[PDB]
Amino acid sequence: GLTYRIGNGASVPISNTGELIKGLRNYGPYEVPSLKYNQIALIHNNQFSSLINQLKSQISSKIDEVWHIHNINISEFIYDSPHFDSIKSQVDNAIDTGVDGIMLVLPEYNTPLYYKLKSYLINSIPSQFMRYDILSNRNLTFYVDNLLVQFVSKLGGKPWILNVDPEKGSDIIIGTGATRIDNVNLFCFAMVFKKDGTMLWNEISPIVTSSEYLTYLKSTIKKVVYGFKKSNPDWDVEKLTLHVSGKRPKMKDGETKILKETVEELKKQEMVSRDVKYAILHLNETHPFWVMGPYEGTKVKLSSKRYLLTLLQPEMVTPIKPLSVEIVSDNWTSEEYYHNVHEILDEIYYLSKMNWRGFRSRNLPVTVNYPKLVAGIIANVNRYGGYPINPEGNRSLQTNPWFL
Amino acid sequence: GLTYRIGNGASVPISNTGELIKGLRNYGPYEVPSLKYNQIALIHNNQFSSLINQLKSQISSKIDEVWHIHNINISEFIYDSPHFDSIKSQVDNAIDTGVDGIMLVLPEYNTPLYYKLKSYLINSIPSQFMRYDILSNRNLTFYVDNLLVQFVSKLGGKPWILNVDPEKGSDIIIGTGATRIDNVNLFCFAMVFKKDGTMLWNEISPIVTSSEYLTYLKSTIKKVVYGFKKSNPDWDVEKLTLHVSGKRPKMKDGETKILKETVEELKKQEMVSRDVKYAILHLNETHPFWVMGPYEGTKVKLSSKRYLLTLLQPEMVTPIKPLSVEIVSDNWTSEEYYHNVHEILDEIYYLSKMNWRGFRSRNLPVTVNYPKLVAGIIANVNRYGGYPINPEGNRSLQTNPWFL
DNA sequence: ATTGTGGCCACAAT
DNA sequence: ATTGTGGCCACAAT
DNA sequence: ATTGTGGCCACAAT
DNA sequence: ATTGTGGCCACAAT
Ligand SMILES: [Cl-]
Ligand SMILES: [Cl-]
Ligand SMILES: [K+]
Ligand SMILES: [K+]
Ligand SMILES: [K+]
Ligand SMILES: [K+]
Ligand SMILES: [K+]
Ligand SMILES: [K+]
Ligand SMILES: [Mg+2]
Ligand SMILES: [Mg+2]
Ligand SMILES: [Mg+2]
Ligand SMILES: [Mg+2]
Ligand SMILES: [Mg+2]
Ligand SMILES: [Mg+2]
């Protein structure tokens, strides 16, 4: 069935990390990132460490041979103390020398230091953190293998995409919703994807109170569609799907009404086709269950509007991590309705196979999973007082997966 | 997998009515009923009717050739008016001539007449009603075929039993619970089954108010176990299962406590083994759902105590009629627990294939289905003021399936 | 912060 | 007394 | 009351 | 305007 497309027109089966890695070695990734400096900084507090040298050697050989990113050099910067100012001084030194990305090794668990540095780096340059105490207790081959999937993605590469039928499913899918920081505060998100799983544009609102949810939900979605349309001016959106998720205020009927108005306003503004066909879906992870005795791709109808996708967890007991899918609004005709239901459910299943955090599928649609990654950063940068992250006006933050 | 055992040691596959009927013709039913008079009365208001003659001819040939009940004669009794007294006069005339059962043809839908006559007959002799206006608009072959399954069962025959492994599952299963007549009144039931699906003994309480539920639940169960033990004095019950069902008062923790006490008291009275292993299960029909794309026998674990059986309903859309199964109490050890879970769930699935109302399986466990049939009669005999039905003291009502 | 899952066991909840 | 949760830790993944 | 399921369509609910 | 329910009726089952 489903396969991943990598470089040189090649495709590999899903659910098979060994063949995916061998495929990258033979054919390269779907897109090799183009870089300005062809230079990466490795920033650490372990000068002359054997492990650092082994780590550097695996990184340099896999970037060249697996990712096909040629002529890269790694420069080292040593910080003298595990504190914000000392590390930041080396980050700034690396940026001053001219680098495309920073790999930053921290000595231990340190939530405030990590989120202060991470928010600074996300606002500056693609970056990848590492924990020396963890790295020193891992199979280094598996560690670096998965590390590079997400670092190459942060550099703007595309490791692999979904091989999907171009005539089925949505022109774009917008993952949208809000995530709660606490009982009162939240932020809205809206992330535009192609049906092949690649993210085109992402927007998040400022942190606001629950009372401001519906205003900022509409404005955040409008902003992401504007950004998508400016960066993809020749994209005609004739089939549009919203995936709504996140722990957010319980205003279901009011929320659906606002989301419908938003699509209608975007139609009037000619940001999507005047004849766009669209559906607004709620995607909810529900309680896991176990088949005690082929649910890969299975679709369950609970009512005309309510469905369940039996996603496998990533005693002949088969673990299922089901996904609730509710159609809360659509402009489909009765004659096309069930055809479209099948297509949107298949689409959600294909999107569940897209994950650039590592080689192994998360078995969770990227339209739900990537906002969760974003929420983890925004919440903790707020909690530990780092540098605010707002992608507006910042093309790198609007188009690259800095949340991986 | 599962098969039905019929006469002469033969067995036929489940889910295949054509082979079940051919099997009865070749080998007979599992048990042919022994009768006193070898005489059935056909009571109707259509003397010299061609249809009545066709009906009589099919009945007489199928009783002999399909059911292997030999030397039966059918006598006719004509009532002159479709009213209780006129029909009852012919019922009494038939009983006076000496008959094993009565087949009674009514002209049309008539709920008060039907339940007054039915309650009289259930208190007198095995009986089978028919509607002339329906019979005159049916394939007579299919009509009589299924008619005789339940009439032979009412005469004490055993059409077929489940072929189950004698070393797996319960020694007896007690279907118990209560059914509401209305918001205030209810009656309790308790029905003892073998694991092959055959009913050994059944008891129902008088109609009482909800305030008296737990008292009569305990007494009704005790009464059915006493009756079972007197009629099966050599039965050792070392493995016991309760299937609790019915719309009844929401007293879940109080009900479970009473059911546990009841088993313990029966242990102390040596009505079951002192070392009996038992479980008390709640069986609930839940909302149907449809697989849009092998659930025959599939078991789903929701928690250590909560399960779902995906029973098939009796667009490649597969209809499921799931059955919730909750273990509310058991004395199993941790080492035997999941082995026993599998056995009780398989058992419930096998019991879902037992139905003597007709040839086609109801796909609902007989421990739930037969109490529902009983509830329909008791409620309506109360509502339309027929003759109360209380099986206590009446061996025919305690041991035969008069509710089919 | 490469990421995960799963066993253990103290403890909370009832 | 029984059931469920959470926090460390071991270790798997190709 | 052999029993079922499924289509239709009026109507209730919102 | 849309969604779901219920009551007749056609008809299937081997
Ligand atoms: Cl349906
Ligand atoms: Cl489990
Ligand atoms: K370049
Ligand atoms: K440089
Ligand atoms: K759902
Ligand atoms: K006899
Ligand atoms: K006689
Ligand atoms: K259950
Ligand atoms: Mg608002
Ligand atoms: Mg369709
Ligand atoms: Mg990451
Ligand atoms: Mg009581
Ligand atoms: Mg076991
Ligand atoms: Mg009947």
Residues facing residue B202 across a β-bridge: B191
SS3 A40: strand
Q: Which two tokens stand for residue B204?
A: 């129902």
Q: Are B318 and B358 in contact (CB under 8 A)?
A: no
How, if at all, do strands B161-162 and B3-5 pair? Answer: antiparallel
How, if at all, do strands B73-78 and B39-44 pair? Answer: parallel
C-beta atoms of A299 and B292 within 8 A: yes
Strand D nucleotides, any atom under 7 Å to a protein CB: 3-4, 12-14
C-beta atoms of B291 and A302 within 8 A: no
Closest by CA to B284, choosing from B313, B345, B325, is B325
Q: Which residue has the tokens 């996603």?
A: A311
Distance from CA of B301 to the nearest CA of A (A): 5
Residues facing residue A329 across a β-bridge: A280
The pair phi, psi for residue A281, each rounded to 5°, is -120, 145
In Å, the largest CA–CA distance within chain B is: 69
Residues 6+ away with beta carbon under 8 Å from A335: none
CA atoms of B284 and A340, how far apart (whole Å):
34
Helix axes A84-97, A111-122, angle to 10 degrees: 20
Q: How far is the CA of B306 from the C1' of C10 (A)?
A: 26
Q: Which residue has the tokens 């495929």?
A: A23
How, if at all, do strands A101-106 and A127-131 pair? Answer: parallel
Vertex A74: Cα angle to A72 and A79 (nearest 5): 160
DSSP labels, A307-364: EEE-PBP----EEE--EEEEEEEE---TTTHHHHHHHHHHHHHHHTT---SSSS--SS
CA dihedral for A367, A369, A372, A373, sign (positive or negative): negative
Contacts B293 to A, Cβ<8 Å: 298-299
CA atoms of A82 and B274, how far apart (whole Å):
69
Which residues of A have a CB under 8 Å from any CB of B?
287, 289-294, 298-302, 308, 315, 317, 338, 342, 345
Helix axes B213-231, B252-268, angle to 10 degrees: 30
CA atoms of B159 and B359, how far apart (whole Å):
10
Closest by CA to B113, choosing from B77, B133, B83, is B83
Q: Are A77 and A39 in contact (CB under 8 A)?
A: no
Q: Which residue has the tokens 């012919």?
A: B90
The pair phi, psi for residue B91, each rounded to 5°, is -55, -45
Closest by CA to B352, choosing from B302, B312, B320, is B312
Chain Cα centroid distance, residue A299 = 24
DSSP labels, A168-219: SS-SEEEEEEEEESSSSEEEEEEEEE-TTS-EEEEEEPPPEEGGGHHHHHHH
Q: How far is CA B362 from CA B14, B186, B321, B353, in A?
A: 12, 25, 11, 7
Convert chain B into a string of H (helix), E (strand) and C (coil): CCEEECCCCCEEECCCHHHHHHHHHHHCCCECCCCCCCEEEEEECCCCCHHHHHHHHHHHHHHHHCCCCCCCEEEEEECCCCCHHHHHHHHHHHHHHCCCEEEEEECCCCHHHHHHHHHHHHCCCCEEEEEHHHHCCCCHHHHHHHHHHHHHHHCCCECCEECCCCCCCCCEEEEEEEEECCCCEEEEEEEEECCCCCEEEEEECCCEEHHHHHHHHHHHHHHHHHHHHHHCCCCCCCEEEEEEECCCCCCHHHHHHHHHHHHHHHHHCCCCCCCCEEEEEEEEECCCEEECCCCCCCEEECCCCEEEECCECCCCCEEECCEEEEEEEECCCCCCHHHHHHHHHHHHHHHCCCCCCCCCCCCCCHHHHHHHHHHHHHHHHHHCCCCCCCCCCCHHHHHCCCCC
**Cβ count near A304 (within 10 Å):** 10
Q: Which residues touch strand D (CB under 7 A)?
A: A 17-18, 21, 138-139, 141-143, 145-146, 358-360; B 303-305
SS3 A38: coil
Query: What's the one-letter identity of residue B296?
Result: E
SS3 A44: strand
CB pairs under 8 A between A and B: 41
CA atoms of B374 and B203, how far apart (whole Å):
10
Distance from CA of B196 to the nearest CA of A (A): 23
How, if at all, do strands A277-285 and A239-245 pair? Answer: parallel
DSSP A32: P
CA atoms of B70 and B206, how far apart (whole Å):
39
CA atoms of A35 and A157, how far apart (whole Å):
10
Strand F nucleotides, any atom under 7 Å to a protein CB: 3-4, 12-14
**Run of H or E including A57:** helix A50-65
Closest by CA to A151, choosing from A401, A395, A381, A391, is A401
Q: Are B149 and B349 in contact (CB under 8 A)?
A: no
Chain Cα centroid distance, residue B111 = 22
Q: Are A129 and A106 in contact (CB under 8 A)?
A: yes
Burial of residue B226 (CB within 10 Å: 0-12, 13-18, 19+) is middle
Burial of residue B250 (CB within 10 Å: 0-12, 13-18, 19+) is exposed
Q: Which residue is nearest to nucleotide E5 (CA to C1')?
A: B314
Q: Are B338 and B275 in contact (CB under 8 A)?
A: no
Q: Which two tokens stand for residue B235?
A: 């039965």
Query: What's the one-letter identity of residue A289?
Result: F
CA atoms of B246 and A193, how far apart (whole Å):
50
Q: Which two tokens stand for residue B180?
A: 């509401």
Closest by CA to B246, choosing from B205, B301, B278, is B205
CA atoms of A259 and A265, how far apart (whole Å):
10
Vertex A212: Cα angle to A210 and A217 (nearest 5): 100
> In chain B, where are the structural domains located?
1-163, 164-404
CA atoms of A373 and A355, how far apart (whole Å):
11
Contacts A291 to B, Cβ<8 Å: 298-301
Residues facing residue B300 across a β-bridge: A291, B308
C-beta atoms of A292 and B315 within 8 A: no
Determine the residue among B289, B296, B309, B320 to mutate to test chain A binding: the one whose Cβ has the most chain A Cβ atoms within 10 Å. B289
**Cβ count near A37 (within 10 Å):** 14
Q: Which two tokens stand for residue A279?
A: 């559906």
Q: Are B298 and B321 in contact (CB under 8 A)?
A: no
CA atoms of B269 and B230, how far apart (whole Å):
13
For B266-273, the CB contacts below 8 A with 24+ separation are B266/B222, B266/B225, B271/B225, B271/B226, B271/B229, B271/B237, B272/B225, B272/B237, B272/B238, B272/B240, B273/B236, B273/B237, B273/B238
Per the annotation, does B128 bind a ligand?
Answer: no
Q: Are B386 and B118 in contact (CB under 8 A)?
A: yes
Determine the residue among A287, A291, A303, A339 to mutate to test chain B binding: the one whose Cβ has the most chain B Cβ atoms within 10 Å. A291
Q: What is the structure's resolution, reported in angstroms to one decimal?
A: 1.7
CA dihedral for B269, B273, B277, B283, sign (positive or negative): negative
Q: Which two tokens stand for residue B358?
A: 């007709």
Burial of residue B236 (CB within 10 Å: 0-12, 13-18, 19+) is exposed
Closest by CA to A307, choosing from A337, A342, A333, A278, is A342
C-beta atoms of B301 and A317 within 8 A: yes
The pair phi, psi for residue B310, each rounded to 5°, is -85, 80
Query: What's the one-letter identity of residue B109?
Result: Y
Closest by CA to A45, choosing from A79, A92, A74, A93, is A79
DSSP labels, A99-152: -SEEEEEESS--HHHHHHHHHHHHTTS-EEEEEHHHHTTS-HHHHHHHHHHHHH
Vertex A122: Cα angle to A117 and A127 (nearest 5): 80
Distance from CA of A17 to the nearest CA of B (A): 27
Q: Which residue has the tokens 């050792």?
A: B236
The answer to whether the beta carbon of residue A364 comes closer than 7 angstroms to any atom of strand C is no
Convert A215-268 into a string of H (helix), E (strand) and C (coil): HHHHHHHHHHHHHHHHHCCCCCCCEEEEEEECCCCCCHHHHHHHHHHHHHHHHH
> N- to C-terminal Cα distance for chain A?
27
Query: What's the one-letter identity of residue A201?
Result: W
Closest by CA to A355, choosing from A199, A155, A202, is A199
Q: Torsion over CA of A342, A344, A349 and A354, rounded to 10 degrees?
A: 150
Q: Which two tokens stand for residue B81?
A: 């008016």
Closest by CA to B87, choosing from B100, B98, B74, B103, is B103
Q: Are B281 and B243 in contact (CB under 8 A)?
A: yes
Q: Which two tokens stand for residue B137?
A: 């608009």
Chain Cα centroid distance, residue A172 = 15
Q: Which two tokens stand for residue B74?
A: 């059918």
Q: Are B319 and B313 in contact (CB under 8 A)?
A: yes
**Run of H or E including A162:** strand A161-162
Q: Are A207 and A375 in contact (CB under 8 A)?
A: no
C-beta atoms of B299 and A315 within 8 A: no
Query: What's the one-letter identity of residue A106?
Result: L
SS3 A281: strand
Helix axes A252-268, A213-231, angle to 10 degrees: 30
User: Where on the phi/psi map is residue A384: left (φ > 0), alpha (ψ -120 to 50), or beta?
Assistant: alpha
DSSP A69: -
CA atoms of B199 and A382, how far apart (whole Å):
67
Q: What is the CA radius of gyration of chain A?
A: 22
Contacts A315 to B, Cβ<8 Å: 338
SS3 A1: coil
How, if at all, do strands A172-180 and A239-245 pair? Answer: parallel
Q: Which two tokens stand for residue B128?
A: 């089978």
Query: What's the one-letter identity of residue A74?
Result: I
Per the annotation, does B404 bind a ligand?
Answer: yes
Residues facing residue B280 across a β-bridge: B242, B329
CA atoms of B375 and A352, how far apart (whole Å):
48
Q: How far is CA B92 from CA A101, B126, B390, in A?
A: 100, 13, 21
Question: In B340-370, which positions are buried (b, 16+ CB within 10 angstroms) versus exposed (e)?
Answer: bbebbbbbbbbbbbbbbbbbebbbbbbbbbb
Helix axes A140-154, A50-65, angle to 10 degrees: 60
Query: What's the one-letter identity of residue A240?
Result: L
Vertex A60: Cα angle to A58 and A63 (nearest 5): 100
Query: What's the one-letter identity of residue B349?
Result: Y
**Run of H or E including A280:** strand A277-285
